[PDB]
């Protein structure tokens, strides 16, 4: 049966919630003497709708805070449904919330039970009201293979936003970004960083003309329109852009494959450059320096790293193999 209740809210609605966004919100307990209780609301009921607000797809934290926020004395309309069987499963298997987020700020654990994260990490949040304590989300760190690694406590959206704001003071990125696994329907653009990135592109554009292509820098600016045409011909666009341009490309949902060619040493770059492009007059010391600064400050943007060996051009084979290996991977994308 499906039941509809109307009552005035006292100091509280006299309720305790279980479940969450994955399985629905559930009455885990009523209070013996309460307007809600007398209205017929009982343990095991799934709260389908409160006032006009949909409750079938709401995180438990949102549900708790919504019902809290309701004004003392005013009226409340609850649509509910008895689900003793579904509720039994939810309690016994202890499931409630389930969704994935991608972080966009650095966080150091504040308790031994907490998870630290860099920018760009993905988490499955499984409990948004961890231990019945507002503020803590229970999350499982998702690895490169998309399997679940370890679990632990991270801050909730609200505190995360606060922490992410104190950190900043171009990306419009929220502290947590809702993400889901998707397959690429297009050959996504390639950007290569590293002391021989310029050489990498030229060899890729040359030896593999039908798989790759270079997006031209017009009077320097590379615009989106040039990239779109390379995609529409079924090729990867090779992009000589900035870290910040990569960030903007991720936000705009183009999620480029980003390869970093990690140099072995300053003197190693010189030897590689002398072999691969003696014609170039670019400084190896400056290229190496920029490479270190880049890795130091923007490693969260990399999707793969290849460790250069200065006496060995096996990086090119590795690069082609890596670029494809990536394309075949699924991507965490916005909602």
């Amino acid at each position: 049966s499906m039941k509809l209740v109307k009552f005035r809210k006292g100091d509280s609605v006299g309720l305790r919630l279980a479940g969450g966004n994955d399985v629905g919100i559930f009455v885990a307990g009523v209070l013996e003497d309460s307007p809600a209780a007398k209205e017929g609301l009982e343990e095991g009921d799934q709260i389908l709708r409160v006032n006009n607000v949909d409750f079938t797809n709401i995180i438990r934290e949102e549900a708790v805070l919504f019902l809290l926020d309701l004004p003392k004395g005013e009226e409340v309309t609850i649509l509910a449904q008895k689900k003793k069987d579904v509720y039994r499963r939810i309690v016994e298997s202890d499931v409630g919330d389930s969704f994935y987020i991608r972080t966009h700020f650095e966080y150091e654990k504040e308790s031994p039970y907490g998870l630290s994260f860099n920018k760009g990490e993905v988490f499955r949040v499984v409990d948004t009201l961890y231990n019945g304590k507002l503020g803590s989300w229970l999350a499982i760190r998702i690895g490169k293979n998309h399997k679940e690694v370890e679990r632990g406590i991270i801050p909730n959206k609200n505190r995360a936003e606060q922490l992410a704001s104190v950190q900043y003071t171009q990306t419009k990125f929220p502290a947590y970004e809702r993400v889901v696994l998707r397959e690429a329907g297009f050959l996504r653009p390639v950007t290569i960083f590293g002391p021989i990135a310029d050489v990498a592109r030229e060899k890729l554009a040359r030896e593999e003309p039908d798989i790759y292509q270079i997006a031209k820098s017009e009077p320097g600016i590379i615009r989106l329109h040039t990239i779109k045409q390379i995609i529409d011909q079924d090729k990867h666009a090779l992009l000589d852009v900035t870290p910040n341009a990569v960030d903007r490309l991720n936000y705009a949902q183009w999620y480029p494959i980003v390869v970093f060619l990690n140099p072995d040493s300053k003197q190693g770059v010189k030897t590689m450059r002398m072999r691969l492009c003696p014609e170039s007059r670019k400084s190896a010391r400056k290229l190496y320096e920029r490479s270190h600064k880049l890795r130091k400050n923007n490693h969260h943007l990399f999707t793969t790293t290849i460790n250069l060996n200065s006496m060995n051009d096996g990086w090119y084979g590795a690069l082609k193999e890596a670029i494809q290996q990536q394309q075949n991977q699924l991507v965490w994308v916005s909602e």
Binding site: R16, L17, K133
Partner: peptide, 7 residues
């Protein structure tokens, strides 16, 4: 025995 949150 987690600390319940009643609203």
């Amino acid at each position: 025995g987690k600390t319940s949150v009643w609203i």
